[PDB]
Design brief:
The structure is a homotrimer.
Chain A (H helix, E strand, L loop, with lengths): L3 E6 L2 E6 L10 H16 L5 E6 L4 E3 L4 H5 L26 E5 L2 E3 L1 H8 L2 E5 L3 E3 L13 H8 L2 H10 L3 E2 H7 L4 E3 L4 H13 L3 H12 L1 E2 L2 E2 L3 H16 L5 H7 L10
Parallel strand pairs in A: 2-3, 3-5, 4-6, 5-7, 6-8, 7-10
Antiparallel strand pairs in A: 1-2, 8-9, 11-12
Helix pairs in contact in A: 3-4, 4-5
PDB class: lyase
Keywords: ssgcid, Seattle Structural Genomics Center for Infectious Disease, carnitinyl-CoA dehydratase, lyase
Assembly: trimeric
Chain lengths: 260, 256, 256
């Protein structure tokens, strides 16, 4: 089974994260499937929009696969590390992207949403960046995108406390576009895609590029955030505390941090 | 007939777009009227604020004049292309600007609100950026300003779908400052102006310059947005879709 | 007595401006105590967060001590107002706004990561009413932290926002009832200090674009603020402002 599925619904490509038994956590196989489907969407002029969703009724994406992290397995597209987490977060394409958040969207899952142009969410879905609670950071763009997409103070609380945010509160803040009845997020996301795909495709695509400040394929304003994220990650990996998140979980206990 | 009228109410200059039969659509005449007025406002120390509004009871500004566009007419101020659309959107002045939106404010009209410092709207007013439905884009600043002034996701849905936004919803998001009773927008805008003109003018003007990041009359942070809008728009006018979009009337896009 | 106090509550440093009789107005002694405490917070691995608050229950901070003499940290003028507003530290900061916060206190709130406020508190930048501007970061930060149009009204009118309205816009995190603002800030502090401190601290640095203890994106804001203040400080209007308040009369501005 591939880590993600891709199918066409008219002029929309639907990409589905396909690891429901692992709460659709992202590993390399997910990145290969999502990444390859996004690139097929970019080069097919018949595709006018993309929807990203998770298999089943429980999870959009629970985050980075923590068992893969403990096993020192790379999470990204083996052929395209430049596409970032899930082959998705640093993978600009011209076509509009919509996250159809069907359930739990925590950590990496919320970062998939931030990376998408638009978000529709099941009313039961929960958002958040709990990475800091287990000695990680939101390295898949979360750390510099959350304050671009939420008011500064609201973004900082979320980032520094790691506490979750309901779909309703996300929508109230303008972090997501709409909250829908349980079970209906895919149809709602296709209806949003149609409200876009009827428009002149070159116009929509020029609009997207200008709105993100894209020059020759690259979101140039994001580069300092990625560079700082990489720089920080390297110091964190060396720390004693870097051992403690996994160690605490393994020993069925609360972590005791040393700030070293 | 002049494309825009300018007059004084005390220490406020009121600029009125004056093509109500064309729903206050912007052409070169409007850009000349609005632009000359702003420059006069900039250089008269007695003018402490400016209010922009549209003639009549139905339209603030319907957008770029589509018949002018179809005839390949230049829409801007002939002597000041660098001021941009309506001689307004890239024409920074030190005096505070308030859009008094008396009605329809679509495309170019929403771009005039974005470019203004404050917005007070008639409850009937509609905002939106429908350029993408017509094979064009919001080239007068809208494509990069809308995501600066609304939450990213909200701005993005407005930009990509082209669908309108009510005045009430615009206020709820903080895109405009107030929504007022039908017919009252000009008086509301003047009352707001006086809450500003009572203050020390050099103070108000310095705060405006710091808040927008102005060095030598240029909003430094907007220049990449303009550069990208210009290069994208060049290619886009060469496409068939950019001709197919107007002249309808349900268009057929070939993505070319 | 010292201008501000610093005390530990577990892994939180509480910094209290210690001048209740003066409404906690900032002078040099305050800047010394606040600045020194932040620096102790920065270098002590046990301090995982910082709460800033005012002594007593009437005032968070009244602003610059109107009986002004330097007000900054004599050894660290680069930290700016109260040794606080241009003094990045790795540890998250929570303003516990326990009373009035017009002007300077709003600038301390803008500088902090998080804000908990008394429902009585008001947030505003009334400096434009007296001939000067919010020079302790307020002008450029208010537009970063409120929606553009809402920030511009606040800045140009000099009128206050209620704590509740500030919370509705996302400018502050929490509004509580008088007497328990510090309790509510410590509860917020604990929701952060429970987490891995190096991850929290790295997240803060990235979120603000920090390279070697400097918020690089703020520097043009500081530079423009100082440039503008230099012209404001010589103007006849900046004399007319306090001269008028003093004499119980309306000021007459010349825009010079």
């Amino acid at each position: 089974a591939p880590g993600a599925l891709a199918e066409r619904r008219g002029n929309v490509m639907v990409i589905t994260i396909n690891r429901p038994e692992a709460r659709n956590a992202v590993n390399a196989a997910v990145s290969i499937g999502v990444g390859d489907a996004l690139e097929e969407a970019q080069h097919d002029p018949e595709v006018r929009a993309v929807v990203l969703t998770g298999a089943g009724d429980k999870s959009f994406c629970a985050g980075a696969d923590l068992k893969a992290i403990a096993r020192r397995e790379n999470l990204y597209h083996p052929d395209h590390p430049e596409w970032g987490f899930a082959g998705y977060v640093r993978h600009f394409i011209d076509k509009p992207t919509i996250a159809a958040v069907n359930g739990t969207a925590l950590g990496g899952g919320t970062e998939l949403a931030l990376a998408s142009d638009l978000v529709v969410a099941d009313e039961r879905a929960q958002f958040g960046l709990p990475e800091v609670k287990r000695g990680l950071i939101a390295a898949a763009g979360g750390v510099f995108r959350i304050a671009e997409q939420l008011p500064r103070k609201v973004a900082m609380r979320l980032l520094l406390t790691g506490e979750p945010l309901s779909a309703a509160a996300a929508r109230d803040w303008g972090l997501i576009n709409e909250v829908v009845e349980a079970g209906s997020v895919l149809d709602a996301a296709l209806a949003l895609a149609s409200a876009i795909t009827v428009n002149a495709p070159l116009s929509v695509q020029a609009s997207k590029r200008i709105a993100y400040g894209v020059d020759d394929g690259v979101v140039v304003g994001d580069e300092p955030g990625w560079d700082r994220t990489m720089r920080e990650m390297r110091a964190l990996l060396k720390s004693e505390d870097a051992k403690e998140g996994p160690r605490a979980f393994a020993e069925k206990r609360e972590p005791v941090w040393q700030a070293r």
